[PDB]
Amino acid sequence: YKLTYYTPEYETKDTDILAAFRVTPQPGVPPEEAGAAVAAESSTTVWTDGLTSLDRYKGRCYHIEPVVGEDNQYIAYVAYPLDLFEEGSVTNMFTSIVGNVFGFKALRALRLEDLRIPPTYSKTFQGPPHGIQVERDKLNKYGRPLLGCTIKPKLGLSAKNYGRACYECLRGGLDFTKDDENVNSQPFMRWRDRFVFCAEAIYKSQAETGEIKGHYLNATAGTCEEMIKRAVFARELGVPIVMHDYLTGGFTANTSLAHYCRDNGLLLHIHRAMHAVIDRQKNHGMHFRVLAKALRMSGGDHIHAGTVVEREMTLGFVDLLRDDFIEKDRARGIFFTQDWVSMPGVIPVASGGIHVWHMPALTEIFGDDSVLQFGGGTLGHPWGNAPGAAANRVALEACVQARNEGRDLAREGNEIIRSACKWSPELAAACEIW
Amino acid sequence: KLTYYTPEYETKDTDILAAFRVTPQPGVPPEEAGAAVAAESSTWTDGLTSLDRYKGRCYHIEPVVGEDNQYIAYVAYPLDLFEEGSVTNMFTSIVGNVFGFKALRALRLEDLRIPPTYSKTFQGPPHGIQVER
Amino acid sequence: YKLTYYTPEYETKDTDILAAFRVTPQPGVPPEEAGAAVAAESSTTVWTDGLTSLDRYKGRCYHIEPVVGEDNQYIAYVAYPLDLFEEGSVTNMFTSIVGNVFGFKALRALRLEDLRIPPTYSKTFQGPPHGIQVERDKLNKYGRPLLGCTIKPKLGLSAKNYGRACYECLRGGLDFTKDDENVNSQPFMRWRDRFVFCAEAIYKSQAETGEIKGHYLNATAGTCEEMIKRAVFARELGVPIVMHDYLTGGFTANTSLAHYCRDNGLLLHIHRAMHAVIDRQKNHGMHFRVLAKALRMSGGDHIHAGTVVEREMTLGFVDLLRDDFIEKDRARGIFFTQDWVSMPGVIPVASGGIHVWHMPALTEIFGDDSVLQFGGGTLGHPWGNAPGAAANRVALEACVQARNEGRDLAREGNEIIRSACKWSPELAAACEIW
Amino acid sequence: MQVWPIEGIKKFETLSYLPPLTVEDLLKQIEYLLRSKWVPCLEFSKVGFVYRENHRSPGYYDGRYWTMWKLPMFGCTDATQVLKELEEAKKAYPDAFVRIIGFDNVRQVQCISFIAYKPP
Amino acid sequence: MQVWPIEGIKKFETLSYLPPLTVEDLLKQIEYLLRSKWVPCLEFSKVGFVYRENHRSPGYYDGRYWTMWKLPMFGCTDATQVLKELEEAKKAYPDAFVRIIGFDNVRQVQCISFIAYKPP
Ligand SMILES: NC(=O)C1=CN([C@@H]2O[C@H](COP(=O)(O)OP(=O)(O)OC[C@H]3O[C@@H](n4cnc5c(N)ncnc54)[C@H](OP(=O)(O)O)[C@@H]3O)[C@@H](O)[C@H]2O)C=CC1
Ligand SMILES: NC(=O)C1=CN([C@@H]2O[C@H](COP(=O)(O)OP(=O)(O)OC[C@H]3O[C@@H](n4cnc5c(N)ncnc54)[C@H](OP(=O)(O)O)[C@@H]3O)[C@@H](O)[C@H]2O)C=CC1
Ligand SMILES: [Mg+2]
Ligand SMILES: [Mg+2]
C-alpha cells in the first residue's frame, strides 16, 4: 500500500536511521508509489504478522520530490527504526538498507546518496582506532597536511628494493610511504619479507631526520587469520601504522582489524579500492559519502578521499569524515544533519596525479587535517626519491607559511611556489618538469 | 593503443582473463579505451624490474551488437599479480582502480577466466553439491 | 590389459603429473606390458568400479623406449591425473607414484628418474621459506658463492668448544658454520646448550667482521614437537638460519618446519642424509633430481647437491632447483620441461673433499648462486680455523674477480690461485698442504 | 643533480624545511596563532629529536615531549611579547633548541609546533 | 704461523678480502656490470657495517641499507662515467664509505655490491 509505506506526514524520530535515495521509477510508476516501494522493499501477508506489530518495524518514505538530476528522477527520504539494526555492525546496516531494494523491477535505477546515523546507533561502534587528534599527538606533527608517497612500480620489485625506495622517500621529508592496494603477499614479494625491509627503512629514515616516520603496511588478506597475522608482526616490529582495503576485504574483517589496532596502538590507513564500481554513476549505486560514513563507523584513521585536480561534493564528505557536527547542505551532498557525538574523525587522503604545483590548491581546499599522497609526483623527480620528497615537503611548507601570514593560496599559489624555488634547488628542478 | 594493446597476444593457461564492457568517452577510440582498461587495472624504479612481466594487456577488442559506443575489451593478467587463495586480492587487482578512469563513461566487468593454477589455491565450497546430498 | 594402461597415442594434459621410469622387465615380459604394468600398479575387478569412471583415475604409460643404459632396460613415461594428489603434500605424491610399483614381480628393477610437476599442483605448495633472492637480500650478500664449514669432529665436542670453532671459522671470512647432520641432541652435547654457544659465536664474529653471519642449527628431531621446540628457541635467539635432514626426518615434518620458517623469517638449510640409500644405483631407486624437486616443493632455502670433484647430471638438477623454467634435456637428466611458475629457487650446496685449489672449478661450474661447504678444507689449515676461512674467502674472491674480468676459470684456475698466494700468506699456506 | 644531505639537516617538523626564519617572518607566524585565538607557548630541550629508549611498541616514542618554558601565554595580544620570552630562553639556555607551540581551548588540543631557535 | 687480525680489517662483502683495487681493476669490475647489462649505482654511508638496534628477530638487521648516490646509471655504456661519480662522491663525502652496486631488470633484483672507497 502506498500509504502503509508512504507517510508524508511522518515526523522522524531522533533514533531513526534515515536514508536519502535517488530513485528512477520505471515508466508508469508514480513517485509516491516508487517511494513507498523503496521503503517497503528495504524493510517489511502471512499469519505470523499477527504475532507482532509490523508498524514498529517498517521503513517509511516520509518525503519524495522530483530531482533536478535528470529524466524522471526523485530523491526519496526513508526512515528506519533503531531496532532493525545490530549494534556495531556496518555489515548489518548495509544488508538491512541496501541488501534487496536495488533489484526491484518497478525501479529503473536506484542510488543511495546519504544516511543519517543517529547517536543511539553510532555510539555502538568503536569508530577510528585513534582519529585525527590522537594521530597528530602520537606522531608529534602539527600545523600542516601530512605527506606520503606510494611506492612504484606497483608489482615486480623485490622486498628489499621496495624498502630501499621507502627509505629514500622518507629521508627526504615525507611522513609516510605506502604499499599499493594490490600489494598484499605475492610470488615476487611475500608480505613478511616486505614488513622486515620496510621496518628497516622506517627506522633508518627516522634516525637520520629526527622526525617520526611510517609506512602503511598492507594487511589486506584472503582470510581474517592472515590479516591479523600481518597486523601482529607489524605490532612486533613496533611500527606506527598498517593498511587495509576495507571494501575488497569487507566490513566484517575491517571492523575486526580496527579493533586490533585500537587494542595495540596501531594507526590504520584505509584504501578504498573498488569504490568506483559502486559510486561512479549518478543514477545507480551508492555515493562515496555513504561508504565514507561507513568506514568512520567501522574504523579507520586515514581514508582515501580522491583528488581535487566535483569540489563541493568532495568537501562535503570531507566534513562528514572529520567534523563532529555537519549541518544539512544538499549543495555539498549532505542530505542530513549529522552529529557524531564525539566519535573521532578520519584524516582524508588526497592522491592521484598531484605534483608540487598543486600544493597551493590542495592545502587551500583540504586544510591541515589531510594527507597529500603523491606517486610520480615524488618518484618522478629528476634527482630521485629523496630530492623529490624534499621538493614536496618544501613546496608544502611554503604554502603553509604563506597561508599563515594571511596570503591567498588560491590567487597567489604560483608566486608562492616560484618564490620557494629561489632557495630550494630541489623544488626548482621539480617545477621544471611539471 | 600502447604497450597495453596487444591484439595478437596468445593468452597463457595461467593468465587470469577479464571481459570488460567498456563505454568510452566521446573522442576515445576503442583501441585506446581497451589499452587504458588494461593499463589502469595493472601498471626510475621501473628499471629495477620488467614492466612487461607484470602489465595487464588488452589482447582483443570488439563492439557490442545493438549497442551504441559499447565494446567488450578482453584483458589478460599474469598469475604472479595475485595472492593465492585471496578473492579479496583478485578483486582489488582487477576492479580496484579502473572503474573511475575519466576516459571511460562507464565500465562493467562481465566475466573472468579463472585458470586452474589459481583456483587450485582456494579451498572452495566447504562441501559442494554431491557431498551435501 | 596392455592397452587399458599402455596408451602410446595419449596426449599429456597440462595438469597431469608425468613420470619417467627406468624399467628393467623380467625375462619374458614385453616392454609394452612392463610399461602398462608400471602405470597400472602405480594407480588403479570389483563391482564398485561401476560406481565411478576408472578411466579418469588411471595412470597411463604413453611411451616406452629401449634405453641405452643397459641389458633389457627401458624408459617408460607415465601420466597421472591431477585429482589423484592431495594438494601441498609431497608425502602423498610419493605415496601415489612410488608407494607400490617397485615391488612388482614382473619387474626385475625400477628407478624413478624424473617428474613433471604441473603448475596446477606446484601452486598448492608454499615452497622455499625464502629462496635465493630473498636470502641474498636478507643477508646483504651479492656477486659470489656463499661459504661455509661443517664443524669437526662430528661428535665428542662440548657445546662450548663447538661454538669456539664456529666463531673462529666465521670471523675468518666464512658466511656460515654448520652442525653435522648427525648432530641433533646427545649426551655429549644437548641441543639447547649448543644453540646458546653457537649464538654467542655468531654474534661475536658478526660484530668483529661487520658482515652478517649464521650457523645452520640442526632442528632435526625424533618428533615434530621437539623439532619445533628447537626452531622456536632459534627464533628467540634471533639467528638467521636453521637446518633439517628432510629425508631422515621426513616430508610431513619438513613441510611443517618450512611453514614455521616462513612464518618466522628463518632460512632453512637442508641436508640430504640417507639419499644414497635411494639414489646411488642406476637400476633401482629414485634419482636425486626427484628428491631435489620434492624438497623445493616441500620447502628449503639451501639443499646439499654433492661435489664436482657426473657433471652434466649435477648441473641438470641444479637448474631444476634454481631456475623458473628448465627445458627438456635428457643429456643432463632432465626428462621433462619443468615450469615452476615463480616458486622461489633453492641454493645448491657443494661439499665433500673440496679445498682452495677447487675454487676455480667450483665457481665455474656452480656460478654465484651456490654455497661452497668445506670441512677439512678450512679446519685443516695449518694456522687454524680463522686463517683457513680467510684462505678460502680470498681464494673464492680471487676467482670471482678474475671471472668478472672475463678470464677463463677452467683454464686459468691454477694461475689465478697462485697469483692470489702472492698477497695472501693464509692462502699460500693452504696451497702448500693441498 | 644534487644529493640530499645525510647529516647536519635534522628536522623539527612544520617549517623546518624552510630557510631560517627572520624576526619578521617569525612574528608573522606568532600573529597567525594570536589571530586564530590560539595560545602560544615555548618549549625547549638539549635533545632535539625523537628516539626510543623505554619502549618500542606501536605509537610509543621518547623525545616527543620537551620542557615548557614558563607557561602558555593566555590572553596574549602582542606577538612581540612571545619574541621577548624567546630571547630570554635563548639567553638562559643558548645550547638548547627552542620551539613555539600553540593550543586551542576549542579543539582542546595542541595544534601548532615550529622551531624558533637552534644552538650554534 | 700468523694470527688473523681482530681489528682494523672490517669487511664489506664481495671483493673486500682482496687488496685495495686499483683504478684499472675497479674499471674492469664496472665493465663486467655493463657487459652483463646490469645497472650500476653508487651508495654511501658514514657507518660501514651491519648492526641490530631496532629489532633482533630472524632476518632483521639495521645497517644493510646505505644511502643512494644520485640514481642508478641506466643506459651507461662508459665505465669511466661511474668512476667520475665515484670521485664526486669522495669529494662531497671524504669521510664516508662508498660502494658500487648493480641491478638487473631481468632478475628484477640487486645482484652486485663491492666497496670502492674507504675513508682515511
Ligand atoms: N614519467 C612519466 O611517464 C609520467 C608519470 N605520470 C605521473 O606519475 C604519477 C602517478 O601517481 P598518481 O597518479 O599521483 O597516483 P597513483 O597512481 O598512486 O594513484 C592514486 C589514486 O589515483 C586514482 N587513480 C589513478 N589512476 C586512475 C584511474 N586509471 N582511474 C581512476 N582513478 C585513478 C585512484 O584514486 P581512488 O583510489 O581515490 O579511486 C588511486 O587510488 C603522477 O604524478 C602522474 O602524473 C604521468 C605522466 C608522466
Ligand atoms: N688431515 C687429514 O688427515 C686429512 C683430512 N681429510 C680432509 O678433511 C676434509 C673433510 O671434509 P669434507 O670431505 O670436505 O666434507 P664432510 O666430511 O663434511 O662431508 C660433506 C659431504 O661429503 C660427502 N661424503 C663425504 N664422505 C663420504 C663418504 N664416505 N661417502 C659418500 N659421500 C661422502 C657427503 O655428501 P652428500 O651428503 O652430498 O652425500 C657429505 O655430506 C676434506 O678436505 C678432506 O680432504 C682427508 C685427508 C687428509
Ligand atoms: Mg595504489
Ligand atoms: Mg656432515
Residue extents of the structural domains in chain D: 1-120
d(CA C403, CA E14) in angstroms, rounded, equals 13
In terms of Cβ atoms closer than 10 Å to its own Cβ (0-12, 13-18, 19+), residue E7 is exposed
What is the separation of C-alpha C304 from the centre of its chain, rounded to a whole number of angstroms?
A: 4
What is the separation of C-alpha A410 from the centre of its chain, rounded to a whole number of angstroms?
A: 25
Beta carbons within 10 angstroms of residue D44's beta carbon:
20
Report the neighbours of A using a cutoff of 3 or more CB pairs below 8 angstroms.
Answer: B, C, D, E
Handedness of CA E13, C218, C278, C334 (dihedral sign): negative
Catalytic choice (A123, A152, A160, A284): A152
- Number of H helices and E strands in chain D, helices first, is 2, 4
E46 and D6 in contact by Cβ < 8 A?
yes
**Grid cell of C357 as nine digits:** 685449489
Beta carbons within 10 angstroms of residue E44's beta carbon:
22
**Grid cell of E65 as nine digits:** 641499507
SS3 D115: strand
SS3 E85: helix
| DSSP code at position A365 | H
d(CA A366, CA E105) in angstroms, rounded, equals 39
CB C231 within 8 A of CB C242: yes
- Identify residue C90 by its one-letter amino acid code: V
d(CA C61, CA C132) in angstroms, rounded, equals 36
Residues of D in contact with A394 (CB under 8 A): 17-18
**Grid cell of C252 as nine digits:** 610431513
D3 and E69 in contact by Cβ < 8 A?
yes
Which residues, in sequence order, are bridge partners of residue E97? E45
Instruction: Give me the phi and psi of C239, to 5 degrees please.
Output: -70, 155
d(CA D8, CA C419) in angstroms, rounded, equals 45
d(CA C268, CA C284) in angstroms, rounded, equals 30
Instruction: Give me the phi and psi of C332, to 5 degrees please.
Output: -115, 20
Distance (angstroms) between ligand 3 centre and the Cα of A181 equals 5
Beta carbons within 10 angstroms of residue E11's beta carbon:
17
CA distances from A195 to A223, A227, D110 (A): 18, 13, 32
CA distances from B110 to A278, B107, B113 (A): 15, 9, 11
For ligand 2, say whether the CB of C81 is within 6 Å of any of its atoms.
no
d(CA E32, CA E26) in angstroms, rounded, equals 10
Helix axes C90-98, C251-264, angle to 10 degrees: 160
d(CA C3, CA C63) in angstroms, rounded, equals 12
Helix axes E79-92, E23-35, angle to 10 degrees: 120
Experimental method: X-ray
User: How many residues does the structure list for chain E?
Assistant: 120
User: How many residues does the structure list for chain A?
Assistant: 434
SS3 A228: helix
d(CA C398, CA C230) in angstroms, rounded, equals 38
Closest CA relative to residue C130, chosen from C338, C343, C350, C295 = C343
Beta carbons within 10 angstroms of residue D106's beta carbon:
10
Closest CA relative to residue B58, chosen from B96, B24, B20, B87 = B20
d(CA C109, CA B70) in angstroms, rounded, equals 65
**Grid cell of E87 as nine digits:** 670521485
Beta carbons within 10 angstroms of residue C192's beta carbon:
12
Dmax (CA) for chain A in angstroms is 81
Does C151 count as an annotated binding residue? yes
Residues of D in contact with A235 (CB under 8 A): 57-58
Q: CA A240, A245, A250 angle in degrees (round to 5)?
A: 120
For ligand 2, say whether the CB of C376 is within 6 Å of any of its atoms.
yes
Distance (angstroms) between ligand 3 centre and the Cα of A50 equals 53
Instruction: Give me the phi and psi of A124, to 5 degrees please.
Output: -95, 5
Residues 6+ apart with CB under 8 A from D71: D41
Does C250 count as an annotated binding residue? no
Closest CA relative to residue A307, chosen from A243, A248, A372 = A372
Does C150 count as an annotated binding residue? yes
Beta carbons within 10 angstroms of residue E53's beta carbon:
13
d(CA C346, CA C369) in angstroms, rounded, equals 9
Closest CA relative to residue C82, chosen from C48, C43, C114 = C43
CB C371 within 8 A of CB C302: yes
Q: What is the CATH number of domain D1-120?
A: 3.30.190.10
For ligand 1, say whether the CB of A293 is within 6 Å of any of its atoms.
no
For ligand 2, say whether the CB of C387 is within 6 Å of any of its atoms.
no
In chain B, the N- to C-terminal Cα span, in Å, equals: 51
| Strand D67-69 with D39-45, pairing | antiparallel
| DSSP code at position A357 | G
For ligand 2, say whether the CB of C31 is within 6 Å of any of its atoms.
no
| Strand D109-117 with D97-104, pairing | antiparallel
Q: What is the DSSP string of A146-192?
A: EEEEE-SSSSS--HHHHHHHHHHHHHTT-SEEE--TT-SSBTTB-HH
CB A308 within 8 A of CB A366: yes
SS3 A257: helix
Q: What is the DSSP string of chain B?
A: --SSB-TT----TT-EEEEEEEEEPTT--HHHHHHHHHHHT---GGGGS-HHHH--EEEEEEEPTT-SS-EEEEEEE-GGGSPTT-HHHHHHHHHSSGGG-TTEEEEEEEEEE--HHHHTTS---SS-HHHH-
**Grid cell of A327 as nine digits:** 549541518
Best of A155, A160, A198, A236 to substitute, by most chain C Cβ atoms within 10 angstroms, is A160
Q: In what order do the strands lie in the sheet with A60-66?
A: A60-66, A74-80, A17-25, A107-116, A285-286
d(CA E83, CA E31) in angstroms, rounded, equals 11
CB C74 within 8 A of CB C64: yes
Q: Using CA positions, which residue lies closest to atom 4 of ligand 1?
A: A376
Give buried/exposed letters for A351-360 (b at 16+ CB in 10 A, else e).
Answer: beebbbbbbb
Closest CA relative to residue B39, chosen from B10, B72, B73, B2 = B2
**Grid cell of D80 as nine digits:** 612581540
Best of A152, A155, A164 to substitute, by most chain E Cβ atoms within 10 angstroms, is A164
Reported resolution in A? 1.9
CB C303 within 8 A of CB C321: yes
d(CA C300, CA A421) in angstroms, rounded, equals 54
Residues 6+ apart with CB under 8 A from A329: A316
d(CA A386, CA A376) in angstroms, rounded, equals 13
Q: Is A160 a residue of the active site?
A: no
A238 and E60 in contact by Cβ < 8 A?
no
Residue carrying the nine cell digits 588488452: B58
| DSSP code at position A82 | G
- Identify residue D95 by its one-letter amino acid code: D
CB A15 within 8 A of CB A106: no
Q: In what order do the strands lie in the sheet with D97-104?
A: D67-69, D39-45, D97-104, D109-117
Q: Using CA positions, which residue lies closest to atom 22 of ligand 1?
A: A352
CB C62 within 8 A of CB C79: yes
Which residues, in sequence order, are bridge partners of residue B5? B58
CB A209 within 8 A of CB A145: no
B100 and A276 in contact by Cβ < 8 A?
yes
D3 and E71 in contact by Cβ < 8 A?
no
Question: What is the count of residue pairs from B and E with beta carbons less than 8 Å apart?
Answer: 20
For ligand 2, say whether the CB of C430 is within 6 Å of any of its atoms.
no
Q: Using CA positions, which residue lies closest to atom 44 of ligand 2?
A: C353
For ligand 1, say whether the CB of A314 is within 6 Å of any of its atoms.
no
- Identify residue C311 by its one-letter amino acid code: R
D60 and A173 in contact by Cβ < 8 A?
no
The alpha carbon of residue A297 is apart from the nearest alpha carbon of chain D, in Å, by 21
Distance (angstroms) between ligand 2 centre and the Cα of C353 equals 5
d(CA B119, CA B117) in angstroms, rounded, equals 6
Residues of B in contact with C88 (CB under 8 A): none
d(CA A391, CA A434) in angstroms, rounded, equals 12
Residue carrying the nine cell digits 581546499: A365
**Grid cell of A209 as nine digits:** 631526520
The H or E element spanning position A25 is strand A17-25
Asked, as a colleague might, if the bond just before C153 is cis with ω within 30 of 0, I would say yes
Closest CA relative to residue A183, chosen from C39, B89, C141 = B89
CA distances from A144 to A140, A169, D16 (A): 12, 18, 12
CB A89 within 8 A of CB A40: no
The H or E element spanning position E58 is none
**Grid cell of C198 as nine digits:** 653457537
Chains B and C touch (3+ CB pairs under 8 A): yes
What is the separation of C-alpha A157 from the centre of its chain, rounded to a whole number of angstroms?
A: 28
Which residues, in sequence order, are bridge partners of residue A18? A79, A116
d(CA B2, CA C77) in angstroms, rounded, equals 45
In terms of Cβ atoms closer than 10 Å to its own Cβ (0-12, 13-18, 19+), residue D109 is middle
Instruction: Give me the phi and psi of C301, to 5 degrees please.
Output: -100, -30
- Identify residue A164 by its one-letter amino acid code: R
**Grid cell of C202 as nine digits:** 655468531
Distance (angstroms) between ligand 3 centre and the Cα of B13 equals 27
3-state per-residue secondary structure call for B22-56? EEECCCCCHHHHHHHHHHHCCCCHHHHCCHHHHCC
Closest CA relative to residue E51, chosen from E60, E62, E42 = E62
SS3 A12: coil
What is the separation of C-alpha D115 from the centre of its chain, rounded to a whole number of angstroms?
A: 4
3-state per-residue secondary structure call for chain C? CHHHHECCCCCCCCCCEEEEEEEEECCCCCHHHHHHHHHHHCCCCCHHHHHCCHHHCCCEEEEEEECCCCCCCEEEEEEECHHHCCCCCHHHHHHHHHCCHHHCCCEEEEEEEEEECCHHHHCCCCCCCCCHHHHHHHHCCCCCCEEEEECCCCCCCCHHHHHHHHHHHHHCCCCEEECCCCCCCECCECHHHHHHHHHHHHHHHHHHHCCCCEEEEECCCCCHHHHHHHHHHHHHHCCCEEEEEHHHHCHHHHHHHHHHHHHHCCEEEEECCCHHHHHCCCCCEECHHHHHHHHHHHCCCEEEEECCCCHHHHHHHHHHHHCCEECCEHHHCECCCEECCCCCCCEEEEECCCCHHHHHHHHHHHCCCCEEEECHHHHCCCCCHHHHHHHHHHHHHHHHHHHHCCCCHHHHHHHHHHHHHCCCHHHHHHHHHC
B44 and A281 in contact by Cβ < 8 A?
no
In terms of Cβ atoms closer than 10 Å to its own Cβ (0-12, 13-18, 19+), residue C68 is exposed
- Identify residue C51 by its one-letter amino acid code: L
For B53, what's the count of Cα atoms within 13 Å in the CB-facing half-sphere?
A: 18
Beta carbons within 10 angstroms of residue C312's beta carbon:
11
SS3 E117: strand
**Grid cell of A129 as nine digits:** 582506532
D1 and E71 in contact by Cβ < 8 A?
yes
Which residues, in sequence order, are bridge partners of residue C18? C79, C116
Q: Is C269 a residue of the active site?
A: no
d(CA A299, CA A131) in angstroms, rounded, equals 9
The H or E element spanning position D24 is helix D23-35
Q: In what order do the strands lie in the sheet with C74-80?
A: C60-66, C74-80, C17-25, C107-116, C285-286
Residues 6+ apart with CB under 8 A from B16: B76, B77, B79, B81, B82, B90, B94, B112, B113, B114, B115, B118
CB proximity under 8 Å: E 65-94 to C? none
Closest CA relative to residue C140, chosen from D81, E2, A161 = A161
Residues of C in contact with A160 (CB under 8 A): 137-138
d(CA A197, CA A165) in angstroms, rounded, equals 10
In chain C, the N- to C-terminal Cα span, in Å, equals: 61
Best of D36, D50, D57 to substitute, by most chain A Cβ atoms within 10 angstroms, is D50
CB C239 within 8 A of CB C265: no
Q: CA C122, C125, C127 angle in degrees (round to 5)?
A: 100
Residues of D in contact with A387 (CB under 8 A): 2-4
Residue carrying the nine cell digits 596408451: C7
Residues of B in contact with E105 (CB under 8 A): 47-50
CB A100 within 8 A of CB A40: no
d(CA C119, CA E67) in angstroms, rounded, equals 40
Domains, chain C, ordered by start: 1-125 (3.30.70.150), 126-434 (3.20.20.110)
For ligand 1, say whether the CB of A377 is within 6 Å of any of its atoms.
yes
User: How many residues does the structure list for chain C?
Assistant: 434
d(CA B22, CA B18) in angstroms, rounded, equals 12
Residues 6+ apart with CB under 8 A from C221: C184, C185, C227, C229, C230, C249
SS3 E109: strand
**Grid cell of A2 as nine digits:** 502506498
Q: Using CA positions, which residue lies closest to atom 31 of ligand 2?
A: C276
Beta carbons within 10 angstroms of residue B65's beta carbon:
7
Asked, as a colleague might, if the bond just before D119 is cis with ω within 30 of 0, I would say no
d(CA E111, CA E120) in angstroms, rounded, equals 28
